[PDB]
């Protein structure tokens, strides 16, 4: 189907490598970077929405990062 739950949730831990081990980090980073590169204006949209949220600066930067992560996955 379309959902197909990932098994990296239940990653079996052992001395040997798992099924597709070399690809996890690049997998997620590539997805995020590609979506951001194709759609740059949403960086500005997320910056504005994060600035209007959160009192302190660190809260606003965390809002910015969490929006910029939750958008490329449409999670």
């Amino acid at each position: 189907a379309v959902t197909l739950p990932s098994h990296s949730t239940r990653k079996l831990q052992t001395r040997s490598q798992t099924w597709l081990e070399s690809r996890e980090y690049t997998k997620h980073l590539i997805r995020v970077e590609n979506w951001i590169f194709r759609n740059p204006g949403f960086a500005l949209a997320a910056a504005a929405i994060a600035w209007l949220l959160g009192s302190s600066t660190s809260q606003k930067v965390i809002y910015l990062v969490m929006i910029l992560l939750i958008a490329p996955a449409y999670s």
């Binding site: 990932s6 098994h7 990653k11 079996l12 052992t14 040997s16 798992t18 099924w19 597709l20 081990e21």
Partner: protein, 49 residues
């Protein structure tokens, strides 16, 4: 054919290889306690070379 989708879904699952009905795993672990109370030394009581 939904097969490469499952192959990428199976990230973090262990490989295994089957010969006959029996399938051998290539990763695991076990815990044994070693009773070394009947282990002797074959060499002692030999004169030096």
């Amino acid at each position: 054919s939904q097969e490469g989708a499952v192959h990428t879904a199976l990230a973090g699952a262990l490989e295994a290889e089957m010969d006959g009905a029996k399938g051998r795993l290539s990763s695991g672990h076990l815990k044994c306690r070693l009773k070394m109370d009947k282990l002797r030394l074959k060499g002692v009581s030999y004169s030096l070379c």
